[PDB]
Amino acid sequence: KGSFSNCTVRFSGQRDHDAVDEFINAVETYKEVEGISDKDALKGLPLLFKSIAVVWWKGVRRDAKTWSDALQLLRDHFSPTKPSYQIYMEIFETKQSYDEVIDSFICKQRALLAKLPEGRHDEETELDFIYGLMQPKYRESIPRHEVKTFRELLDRGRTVERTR
Template identity: 40%
Template sequence: MAEQVVMSDEQFTQLLETLRLNTNTSQISNIPSPPIQSGNFINCASRFNGDGNSDVNAFIDAIEIYIDCIRISNDNAFRGLPMPLDSFAATWFRGVKSSINTWNEAVNLLRITFGPKKPPHFVYRKLFSREQDSKTHTNVFICKARSILAQLPENTLTETVQLDMVYELLKKIREKEPRDKIEMRTELLKEAPSVEEFFDQNITCEQRDTIKRPRCAYCKNLGHIKDECRKLAYKLSKPPEGVQQKITQVSSIQVVDKEKPSTPRVSQNLLQQTSQLTSSFSCYGCGQPGYIRTNCPN
C-alpha cells in the first residue's frame, strides 16, 4: 500500500508552480522556430545607384529591414546584393566583389565608399548656418538637424551635446522652455506641439492687431492711397505756371484791344494763342474748357 504524502500549504503551492513552469517550458520548446528562408532582393523596392543624390545609409537601413522581415540569410543577402544596385554602384560592386566575402564586409565597404566624407567642422558649419524661422515646424527642423549630425562619425558627440546644439537653434522652444527642463530628445519632441500651438495663436493675434492703414505715396497722409489723393488731383487740375502767365497776359491785351480797336491783327493772333492754350485744360469742378476752378464762373 502506497504511503501517503503529507505537505503543508506552502509546499503544495510550490509544487503547483513548479509543474506549471515545466508545462510552459515544454510547450515553448515544442513550437518550431521559423526557418531562415532562402529569399532574395527580387521584390525589394529600395535601389541605390551611387550618384551624389543617393543616401547610402538610408539604403542600407532599408535593405537590412527587408532582410529581417523576409528572413534572408546573410549568405543569400551577400550573393543577391547586386540586384538592388544600379548604374555606377552595380559596376563598383562587380569590381570589388572578389575582395569581400561576407555581408558585413559588403555593408562596411558601401558605407566607406559612398558615405558622406565631410569633415566634422564642415558638418558643424552646415548645422549652425541656419536657425529655425517662424515658418518651419519644430519637429521638421529637428529631423533636418539630426540628418546633418548623422554625417559625423559614430560616437563623435554624445546625445546631451547634440541636444545642446539643436536646442540653441530652436527659436520657438528656446523662448518657451528652459534647457534644464529638457533632458532627452523625446521630451523635446513631446514639447514641440504645445509650443507650436502657443506661437501660432500669438502670431494670429499680432496679425489681427497690426492691420496697417493705407498711406498716400504723394502727401504721406494715412487713410488713402495716391490714386485717391485730393491734393494730387487739385495739382493736376491747375494749368502749368507758364500757361497761367500767358493767359493773364492775353486777358490784359484783350482789354487793351477793346479800348484800342486800331490793332485788330495783334488781337487776333493773341486770341488764337489763347484758344490753343485754353483748350488744353478745363475746370476741375464742372469741366468747362478754358477755366480753372478758382476763376470758373459756374
C-alpha cells in the same frame, strides 16, 4: 521563402549620406526579417543595382568575400565620412527660418548630429547645442533649465504651435 527576388528599393549612386544609409538599413532589415543565410545573400546582390553602380560592381566583384565586407565596402566607396569641423560649421550656418514646423527642424538636426563619433557627447550638451538657433516665436515662452530631456522640447513645442 526566396532570396532577393524583386523589391522596390534600389540604389543608384546619388552620393549622399541619407539615401545610402536608408538603402543599407532597409536591406539589412529585410535580410533579418525574411531569414536568409549569409552565403545565399551575396549571390543575389546584383539584382538590386540599376545604374552606374552596376558598372561599379562589374569591376570590384573579386574584392568581396563575406556579407559584412561587401556592406562595409559599399559604405566606404560612396559615403565619404566627412570630418568633424565641417559638421560643426554646418550646424551653425543655417538658423531656423520663420514659418517652419518644429519636428522637421529637430529630425534634420538629430540626423546631422549622428555623424559625429559615438560617445563624444551626452544628452545635456546635445540639447545645449540645439537651443541656440531657434526662433523667438518659441524662445519667449519656454526657458532653459526647465526642459531636461530631448522629448520635452518637442512636447512643449507642440503646445505653443497649437496655441499660435
